[PDB]
Ligand binder design. Structure first.
Ligand SMILES: O=C(O)c1cccc2c1OCCO2
Ligand SMILES: O=C(O)c1cccc2c1OCCO2
Ligand SMILES: [Cl-]
Length: 147
């Protein structure tokens, strides 16, 4: 029916059908369009107190709860989707990954290199698509597939 991971759902506020991807946590009103050895992704990471390494270039001691990290992620997603901010701008400013200095770019990678939820989301994104919140042991990610 739909590309990998996508399913139909009903909006609770509007009653209109939308589409949700349970691999990427992407959600959208529009019916999703239409696997390579490698993809290229950028990401914005928000770490929390239960991150594998609760430290980043932004903060020596990361203390925010996972719930607070998710709220931050949700707010960045809203600004990206509204066009108020660019993904790259938010990643450079607020990603708890050292890839922040490359606008979140991780370069290209294969299956078998990244943490599984990140890998699965990356490979289920189409080129140009953005994930919803993706959870790993590092924290919570927004992933943008660029190639
Ligand atoms: O170590 C770094 O400064 C760095 C710079 C750009 C991209 C990265 C980086 O480290 C984590 C992987 O992705
Ligand atoms: O793997 C790393 O530590 C690293 C360091 C600098 C730049 C990078 C890196 O990983 C891939 C992205 O580009
Ligand atoms: Cl915070």
């Amino acid at each position: 029916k739909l590309p990998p991971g996508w399913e139909k759902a009903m909006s609770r506020s509007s009653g209109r059908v939308y589409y949700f991807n349970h691999i990427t946590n992407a959600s959208q009103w529009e019916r999703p369009s239409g696997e390579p050895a490698r993809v290229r992704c950028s990401h914005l990471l928000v770490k929390h107190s239960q991150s594998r390494r609760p430290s980043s270039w932004r903060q020596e001691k990361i203390t925010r709860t996972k719930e607070e990290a998710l709220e931050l992620i949700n707010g960045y997603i809203q600004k990206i989707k509204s066009g108020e901010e660019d993904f790259e701008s938010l990643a450079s400013q607020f990603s708890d990954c050292s890839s922040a200095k490359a606008r979140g770019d991780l370069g290209a990678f294969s299956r078998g290199q990244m943490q599984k939820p990140f890998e699965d989301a990356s490979f289920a994104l189409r080129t140009g698509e953005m994930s919803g919140p993706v959870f790993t042991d590092s924290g919570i990610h927004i992933i943008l597939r660029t190639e």
